[PDB]
């Protein structure tokens, strides 16, 4: 069934009940300030780093889930309820939650009083703004008192959750009931010492009362749903001293029949130069100048609407680079709105903070952020360019690099492991995608240091040679690249052999020696190594280029000679040179990663989709038969049923979940693309629909998570929970699926010198038009698609047929019309 | 204002209401398995290590506090309530929680049904047993269904709370409704991989139903107080697959008026040898042999009662070594029961897990465990001996040592800092105390490695020499010991100068250079260096001893020459060589640590308590005047009002809390002892009463925490929360206060060759008798105390007068009657 519906004209998902299978959230902000907001006002906000600068507290695995956030307690004649339903759970006459692009609206109505709240992070602002509209829907005048509520976090989320022996005595706040634009509360924990920042929580009106101490506001023995203050109907004007600081204002409202009133609340992040931190000589009063300015910028509903309009224009402009109009509205919906929206989120968040990733140990992964670029370069190329520079700056002189870096400092760390041999090549993938998109070859000349070291700068292209050379010089006995800690699959640890519980397979020291090789890195090298070669040729390096393509040829040969099992590609060779992912073994006979990536690299591709002799065709057929399910393709089959000490973390998961038999959505688009390469568009489009949000909305009670964004994994067959997803939002499957549908299914993909139009989506989408802005020109691509198996397009440009499927880039400001016949 | 009372005869603290100022807990277990149990059944259990082997989940800073633990939902004709009050909070006709030694009883009654639960960890068992007795107190037959409940933790507490991206898919259980002694549930997360252990939760009867999935038991949108299963009146027989495993059984009972029924539940920790892990050849079913045996040892109420009586005898024996009988029942209560009970707990827990310390970052402290030995050696000398060995094994060859070690592996780590220069000398303190107590000189010969390195073994005594030499070879320009990271005071970081927010002062690396010196370590060195000299002389090391005594004299000379501010002792010299803790500064004029420790070391002691010219008297007079409050002695005065970059973490706390103006109870006993040294017993006893539990019970509403145990800190005079405590249970305050009252106030203390009897407690305790078992002999010490200042005792033994106050140890098996006159 469903718990809501898409509203395409408004670019929102409408949740019609608070009783969803799981908390469904939205991300506010797209610059440096972010907020996680559930359809029940749950979540938290942070500035740049969810671990080091978290403004508000949020409890993971709470009972019940998501029982804390931005609340507005309404007391109407003694009756207390919250429009977000939770935490009070009063019966509401009406309830609706709309998640839009960069903003959300939550509305609850009870006994003649409707309360709607608009949540969003304004462009250029480090704050979350709430515009509350309370309306009297009865035929008689009403009065009520509204109590706002937000629980602060002590900035360092990790410290906040574990170091009470210290932090229960450091909570500090300041109260300003009579500010220039209304009342405001200041959370200044540790501002006394090393912090040059504080948070503010204010409203555009002089509040009747306030509260900053949670225990006083909530009351002993009470949950947020039984908060004492709202029930009493009067603030306690508590001034916190240690323990748990909060922000709360009481506002008395009076409304004639049909009359409404707006209230604007602001949660802001402020900083002061060290030499202007205090308002007094005694250094006891925080300088509120920046806070006042901010509150002044959102003192009226007109300012809020103006900012919301700018955010709308912002998104209209971002989404104008790639769009499609076809016969499939679920497809259009994904392509024009949601997939691109999610790509903005993953670009900004990586895999750090969601309702699954706790925003503590994970920052910006090297592999993750490079891949996120693939689906983000068309949105804001300049930010992609800077990201590439930041990512490459955490690379080592020998080619390898830190697996991730801390958001706040942009410095690498080993917190979640090191020495993953697939990491280096991803840098080449991200740069190539960026050059193809923007044509900014100058980026290759950008000076980039190694591990942020002063004096170690070399041109970015040199960094790429280091990455390319790292693989060529780290191949094993079969000519395949050594896997190291692991490859794309973090759970394939062939140099681990751990028997000690508790220690993460991710950071437990690997064993020296062995000949563990990866077939995945082999295909990855064949694919991106070829791009490296092209980048070198363009720079005039015939020497470097020529050698590079030789190595690519050697590894390609190695894959066919030593990485072929008979009906599908081998996965790897373990520490002892034993094959992994072979039909000879009882479990884990076939692994999906190499099948998709090898064919993407053109390995084993025959003369056509019906060439049942080509290994690429055999591999894909095997994938379909052994890994296919109604919810997507599982990682490997059969799943491991006992701990395989030589394979690492993989077999530690019960069958059907995560890397052991689960549908790891991220690698499904690789098979999708592989199928388009071989010329089987119908099957590729089929796989796309099995895991895409819009197509799975009708089974929301099974998927359970958000119906408008991709998740990391869906329980595979073999799991009692088959079809149920976990880890929504933060996943590379967003970037890879946008790549798949926009560039290979719909077929519009940027190349170095032109735009290739190579549709391969099958018969289910007979006609569509893609509007693509590229290199400053607008391309109107009109496709008439027969869907014929293996049939590829022929183009006519501006009234004249052309050869091939690559349209040379037209000059900026131009508008070219290409007619496509497939 | 009280919420209960002491029951001396039963050795319990009786809590008469569930509405306490804060959750009040008891610790179950004294060997390898421990349980934190609040008066509302809240808390959790773990095996040896709270971070690595935590059986059950507990949420710190939950709303409301302590909502989660061992619950028993009672469904009486549709009405659902819990005897522990929380989480349902149904009105109870009667409620009472009794915390005893190693066990607790919680009783709740509602509408004709009384439910009593006995909680405890049996000796020699790694489990928590619950004996539940249900009684029909009405005049008509009753039928009710009891639902047990406990939420499992995924072993690694840190992973459990932060790695959901993985662990929401690994939870695994096994259900055994028809076991040999009743029904049982097995929590076996990760047993399929590296863990050789699992937990069991069973009941001594065949249950009507069960539940292993939290969400199914509790229900969507519900808190534990609104659990659906109990409300429905029957188990859902849920079998978990990932998410949140729980243990729950349902038992229907029918009781005639006045009839009662017993049910015995068991939460156990089981291990299996690798070759005995599975019941099947396919390795899918856990071998339950050890679990079946455990459940068999507690299948009857008779077995429970026998184990409880064994526990009672165990404590009677432990408390028979030192006890007193005076005219003060609060004093007696503390000395005979509670202070000693707490010392066993600190010995076992160090500072790792309480309702404040989270059982994650902290293991067994080097400084902490050495000091706890001071109040534990008389209880179980054999276990203190091993602890000394384990501690010394984490020491480095140069004398320095790991600041703490992981409880499960006994290996040190730098998780909470490194290079604390006071650490080394504490090892000598612990060993000296142990030898004086047991006369086990052989321990100095025990082979002991450095940093657990096999083959690096060296006599324990040699480790002491390393500690001694470390201080000798690390003195500054004034001849005082270099402070390093920090001394006893973790917040006096003079080599820090941090301006980077969020990074712990404890772990942030420090700056080389400077001349920062510590007066505290100087005093510490004089005190324990003297002990080292004695041990060296007794070992036959005449020259080493002579040398040692020489170094000791130099350090004490430096204290009086470079560590005296005029009216009190200086605290230290900063990185720049400037004095810390001087009247020349506006804040932090006088610090308490050096005042108490220097005098304890005898530095500055004059002709008597009336000698106003003796520095020791001036110092203590300054302490009384500037640091004294009705709740104890504050750490320093005035507290710092702005961040002092050269002092480290200390000034980061708001005035009046923790190390910045708070009453850090741990250092109060040093001033208490100092006072008995200068001959002012009345003042010393006064200070003892200010911070002692039994004396603060009458103001439970202000202390707020447990009224039967010491806390780490009580808010100081500069705090708005003055008088309010934080961090109860785990503190060196327990061991040090026991040392103070048992050895210096009451005056009975062990020496190398005899038992010292030197009372110095003032006129408030005119007569008392101490029964002390030492070196296998019993000493009945009858004291007639005038309490006159400066007055020291004269003794008579078995009818004859003796010289001085030291009674040479009598042969084992004898009873010595000492008559003391003061
Ligand atoms: O790491 C433990 C230390 O942490 C510091 O922040 C606290 O102020 C000390 O009281 C404590 O001993
Ligand atoms: O640390 C991150 C990694 O943790 C592993 O436990 C998971 O199986 C991986 O999916 C994840 O990438």
Handedness of CA A322, A328, A329, A334 (dihedral sign): negative
CA B100, B105, B107 angle in degrees (round to 5)? 145
- Confirm if B107 and B183 have CB atoms less than 8 A apart: no
The CA A491 to ligand 2 mean position distance, Å, reads 7
- Confirm if B363 and B407 have CB atoms less than 8 A apart: yes
Residue carrying the six token digits 């090297």: A366
Q: Is A439 on the interface with B (CB under 8 A)?
A: no
CA B507, B509, B513 angle in degrees (round to 5)? 140
DSSP-derived secondary structure letter, A444: G
The catalytic residue among B372, B490, B574, B758 is: B490
By C-alpha distance, which of A467, A473, A518, A472 is closest to A495? A518
- Tell which A residues from 449 to 488 touch B, by Cβ distance under 8 Å: none
| B161, B190, B653: residue with CB nearest A170 | B653
The CA A191 to ligand 1 mean position distance, Å, reads 19
ω into residue A638 within 30 of 0, thus cis?
A: yes
Proportion of chain B in helix, strand, coil states, percent, rounded to 5:
30, 25, 45
Residue carrying the six token digits 């780490």: B712
Give me the DSSP letters along B514-576: ---EEHHHHHHHHHHHHHHHHHHHHTT-HHHHHHHHHHHHHHHHHHHHHSB-SSSB--EE-TT
Distance CA A663, CA B130 (A): 43
Give me the DSSP letters along A576-599: TS-EES-TTSSS--EEHHHHHHHH
Distance CA B425, CA B421 (A): 8
The two tokens of residue A410 are 């942009």
| C-alpha dihedral, B75 to B79 to B83 to B87, nearest 10° | 100
Kindly determine whether residue B161 and residue A727, on different chains, have CB atoms separated by under 8 Å.
no
By C-alpha distance, which of B773, B774, B735, B739 is closest to B439? B774
Residue A103, strand partner residues:
A120
By C-alpha distance, which of B521, B525, B490 is closest to B662? B490
How far CA B86 is from CA of A215, B77, B81, B111, B150, in Å, comes to 17, 20, 9, 17, 14
| CA-based nearest residue in chain B for residue A648 | B193
Residue B37, strand partner residues:
B26, B43
The two tokens of residue B428 are 């000598």
The CA B368 to ligand 1 mean position distance, Å, reads 12
Residues in chain B: 822
Distance CA B133, CA B74 (A): 12
Distance CA A715, CA A656 (A): 6
How far CA A726 is from CA of A354, A662, A669, A703, B165, in Å, comes to 11, 10, 18, 9, 8
What's the resolution in A? 2.1
Hey, how many other C-beta atoms are within 10 angstroms of the C-beta on B316? 11
> Does the annotation mark B490 as catalytic?
yes
| B169, B500, B720: residue with CB nearest A241 | B720
Residue B493: partners with Cβ closer than 8 Å, 6 or more residues away: B485, B486, B505, B510, B647, B648, B649, B650
How do A183-187 and A197-203 pair as beta strands?
A: antiparallel
| CA-based nearest residue in chain B for residue A502 | B156
By C-alpha distance, which of A346, A503, A506 is closest to A415? A506
CA B157, B161, B166 angle in degrees (round to 5)? 100
- Confirm if A16 and A96 have CB atoms less than 8 A apart: yes
| CA-based nearest residue in chain B for residue A727 | B165
- What's chain B's Rg over C-alpha atoms? 28
Residues in chain A: 822
Q: Is B218 on the interface with A (CB under 8 A)?
A: yes
- Confirm if B693 and B665 have CB atoms less than 8 A apart: no
Kindly determine whether residue A192 and residue B726, on different chains, have CB atoms separated by under 8 Å.
no
Give me the DSSP letters along A80-117: EE-TT-TTTT---SEEEEEE-SSEEEEEEEETTEEEEE
Distance CA A459, CA A471 (A): 20
Q: Which stretches of A587-664 are DSSP H helices? A: 592-600, 615-627
Ligand 2 pocket check: which of A351, A353, A358, A490 to mutate, most ligand atoms within 8 Å of Cβ?
A490
How would you class A389 by CB atoms within 10 Å of its CB: exposed for 0-12, middle for 13-18, buried for 19 or more? middle
Distance CA B404, CA B54 (A): 19
Residue A200: partners with Cβ closer than 8 Å, 6 or more residues away: A184, A185, A186, A187, A266, A267, A268, A270, A288, A291, A294, A295
How would you class A349 by CB atoms within 10 Å of its CB: exposed for 0-12, middle for 13-18, buried for 19 or more? buried
Distance CA B674, CA B684 (A): 8
User: Which residues line the pocket of ligand 2, CB cutoff 6 A?
Assistant: A 416, 490-491, 506, 649, 658-659; B 166
- Tell which B residues from 333 to 372 touch A, by Cβ distance under 8 Å: 351, 356-358, 360-361
| B68, B194, B358: residue with CB nearest A164 | B358
DSSP-derived secondary structure letter, A328: -
| Residue B30 C-alpha from the chain's centroid | 12
Distance CA B522, CA B563 (A): 9
**Residues preceding discontinuities in chain A at C–N > 2.5 Å?**
none
Kindly determine whether residue B222 and residue A61, on different chains, have CB atoms separated by under 8 Å.
no
Distance CA A779, CA A202 (A): 48
- Confirm if A603 and A562 have CB atoms less than 8 A apart: no
Buried/exposed A146-175: b ≥16 CB within 10 Å, e otherwise: bbbbbbbbbbbbbbbbbbbbbbbbbbbbbb
Proportion of chain A in helix, strand, coil states, percent, rounded to 5:
30, 25, 45
Distance CA B492, CA B512 (A): 16
DSSP-derived secondary structure letter, B627: I
Kindly determine whether residue A283 and residue B721, on different chains, have CB atoms separated by under 8 Å.
no
B730 lines ligand 1 (CB under 6 A): no
The two tokens of residue B25 are 């807990």
- Confirm if B524 and B508 have CB atoms less than 8 A apart: no
Active-site annotation of A, residues: 490
Residue B317: partners with Cβ closer than 8 Å, 6 or more residues away: none
Distance CA A461, CA A467 (A): 10
First to last CA, chain A: 36
Kindly determine whether residue B195 and residue A501, on different chains, have CB atoms separated by under 8 Å.
yes
First to last CA, chain B: 37
- What's chain A's Rg over C-alpha atoms? 28
Residue B625: partners with Cβ closer than 8 Å, 6 or more residues away: none
Residue A344: partners with Cβ closer than 8 Å, 6 or more residues away: A30, A318, A376, A379
- Confirm if A432 and A425 have CB atoms less than 8 A apart: no
Angle between the A592-600 and A519-538 helix axes, to the nearest 10 degrees?
Answer: 20
DSSP-derived secondary structure letter, A285: S
Residue B284: partners with Cβ closer than 8 Å, 6 or more residues away: A641, A642, B278
DSSP-derived secondary structure letter, A350: T
- Tell which A residues from 75 to 114 touch B, by Cβ distance under 8 Å: 86, 89
Element (H, E) at A216: helix A214-218
Residue nearest to atom 10 of ligand 1 (CA): B490
Q: What is the three-state SS of A491-533?
A: CCCCCCCCCCCCCCCCCCCCCCCCCCEEHHHHHHHHHHHHHHH
Residue B756, strand partner residues:
B749, B806
Structural domains for chain A: 1-271+700-710 (2.70.98.40), 272-321 (1.20.890.20), 322-328+746-822 (2.60.420.10), 329-680+711-745 (1.50.10.10)
Give me the DSSP letters along B407-442: TTTTEEE-TT-S-BTTHHHHHHHHHHHHHHHH--GG
Q: Is A61 on the interface with B (CB under 8 A)?
A: yes
Disruptive mutation site among B228, B245, B501, B639 for chain A (greatest number of A CBs within 10 Å): B501
Distance CA B28, CA B44 (A): 10
Q: What is the three-state SS of B285-343?
A: CECCHHHHHHHHHCCCHHHHHHHHHHHHHHHHHHCCCEEEEECCHHHHHHHHHHHHHHH
By C-alpha distance, which of A247, A249, A74, A129 is closest to A178? A249
Residue A118, strand partner residues:
A105, A131
Give me the DSSP letters along B781-821: EEEE----TT---EEEETTEEESTTEEEPPPTT-EEEEEEE
The two tokens of residue B83 are 């005897």
Buried/exposed A412-436: b ≥16 CB within 10 Å, e otherwise: beebbbbebbbbbbbbbbbbbbbbb
The two tokens of residue A42 are 């749950």
| C-alpha dihedral, A330 to A333 to A335 to A339, nearest 10° | -100
How far CA B382 is from CA of B378, B506, B556, B779, in Å, comes to 10, 33, 35, 21
Residue A147: partners with Cβ closer than 8 Å, 6 or more residues away: A72, A73, A75, A227, A229, A230, A235, A248, A249, A250
DSSP reduced 3-state for B506: coil
Residue A248, strand partner residues:
A211
């Amino acid at each position: 069934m469903r718990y809501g519906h898409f509203d395409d004209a408004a670019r929102e998902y409408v949740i019609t009940t608070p009783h969803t299978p799981y908390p469904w959230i939205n991300y506010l902000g797209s610059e440096q300030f972010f907020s996680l907001l559930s359809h029940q006002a749950g979540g938290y906000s942070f500035y740049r780093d969810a671990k080091m600068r978290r403004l508000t507290r949020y409890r993971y695995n709470n009972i019940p889930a998501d029982a804390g956030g931005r609340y507005l307690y309404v007391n109407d004649g003694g009756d207390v309820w919250t429009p977000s339903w939770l935490p009070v759970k009063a019966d509401l006459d009406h309830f609706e939650a709309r998640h839009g692009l960069g903003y959300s609206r939550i509305t609850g109505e009870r006994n003649g009083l409707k309360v709607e709240t608009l949540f969003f992070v304004p462009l250029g602002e480090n704050a979350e703004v709430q515009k509350v509209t309370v309306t009297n829907t009865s035929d008689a005048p009403k009065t009520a008192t509204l109590f706002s509520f937000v629980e602060f976090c002590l900035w360092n989320a990790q410290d906040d959750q574990t170091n009470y022996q210290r932090n229960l005595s450091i909570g500090e706040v300041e109260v300003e009931q009579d500010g220039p634009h209304g009342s405001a509360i200041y959370h200044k924990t540790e501002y006394r010492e090393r912090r040059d920042h504080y948070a503010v929580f204010g409203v555009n009106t002089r509040a009747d009362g306030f509260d900053t101490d949670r225990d006083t506001f909530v009351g002993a023995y009470n949950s947020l749903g039984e908060a004492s203050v709202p029930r009493a109907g009067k603030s306690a004007d508590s001034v916190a001293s240690g323990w748990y600081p909060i922000g709360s204002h009481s506002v008395a409202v009076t409304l004639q029949p049909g009359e409404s009133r707006d209230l604007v609340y602001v949660l802001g992040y402020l900083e002061n130069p060290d030499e202007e931190k205090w308002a007094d000589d005694a250094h006891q009063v925080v300088n509120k100048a920046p806070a006042h300015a901010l509150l002044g910028r959102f003192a009226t509903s007109e300012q809020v609407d103006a900012a919301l309009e700018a955010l709308n224009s912002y998104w209209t402009n971002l989404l104008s680079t790639y769009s499609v109009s076809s016969t499939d509205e679920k497809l259009d919906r994904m392509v024009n709105i949601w997939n691109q929206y999610q790509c903005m989120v993953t670009f900004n968040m990586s895999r750090s903070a969601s309702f699954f990733e706790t925003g503590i140990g994970r920052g910006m992964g090297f592999r993750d952020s490079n891949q996120d670029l693939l689906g983000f370069v068309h949105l804001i190329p300049e930010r992609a360019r800077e990201r590439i520079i930041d990512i490459a700056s955490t690379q080592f002189a020998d080619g390898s690099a830190y697996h991730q870096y801390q958001p706040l400092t942009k410095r690498g760390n080993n917190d979640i492991g090191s020495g993953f041999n697939d990491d280096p090549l991803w840098l080449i993938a991200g740069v190539a995608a960026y050059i193809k998109e923007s044509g900014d070859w100058g980026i290759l000349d950008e000076p980039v240091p190694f591990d942020n070291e002063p004096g170690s700068e070399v041109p970015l292209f040199e960094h790429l040679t280091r990455s390319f050379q790292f693989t060529v010089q780290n191949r094993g006995p079969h000519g395949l690249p050594l896997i190291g800690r692991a490859d794309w699959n973090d759970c394939l640890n062939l140099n681990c052999f751990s028997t000690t519980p508790g220690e993460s397979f991710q950071t437990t020291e690997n064993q020296a020696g062995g000949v563990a090789e990866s077939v995945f890195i082999a295909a990855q090298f064949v694919l991106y190594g070829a791009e490296y070669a092209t980048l070198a040729e363009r720079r005039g390096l015939a020497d470097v280029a020529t050698e590079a393509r030789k190595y690519v040829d050697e590894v390609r040969a190695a894959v066919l000679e030593h990485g072929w099992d008979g009906q599908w590609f081998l996965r790897a060779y373990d520490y002892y040179g034993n094959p992994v992912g072979t039909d000879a073994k009882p479990e884990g006979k076939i692994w999906i990663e190499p099948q998709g990536f090898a064919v993407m690299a053109g390995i084993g591709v025959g003369e056509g989709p019906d060439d049942a002799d080509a290994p690429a065709v055999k591999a894909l057929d095997s994938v379909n038969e052994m890994l296919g399910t109604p919810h997507g393709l599982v990682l490997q089959y059969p799943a491991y049923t006992t701990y395989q000490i030589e394979l690492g973390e993989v077999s530690t998961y019960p069958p059907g979940y995560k890397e052991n038999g689960g549908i790891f959505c991220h690698n499904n688009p690789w098979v999708i693309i592989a199928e388009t390469v071989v010329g089987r568009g119908a099957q590729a489009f089929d796989y796309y629909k099995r895991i895409t949000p819009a197509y799975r909305e009708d089974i929301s009670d099974t998927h359970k998570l958000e119906p408008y964004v991709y998740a990391q994994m869906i329980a595979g067959k073999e799991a009692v929970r088959a079809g149920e997803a976990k880890n929504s939002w933060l996943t590379g499957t967003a970037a890879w699926n946008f790549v798949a549908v926009s560039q290979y299914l719909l077929g519009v993909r940027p190349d170095y010198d032109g735009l290739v139009v190579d549709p391969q989506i099958g018969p289910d989408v007979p006609s569509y038009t893609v509007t693509r802005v590229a290199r400053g020109a607008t391309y109107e691509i009109t496709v008439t698609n027969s869907g014929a198996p293996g049939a590829r397009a022929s183009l006519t440009v501006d009234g004249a047929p052309v050869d091939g499927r690559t349209v040379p880039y037209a000059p900026a400001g131009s508008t070219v019309r290409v007619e496509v016949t497939v």
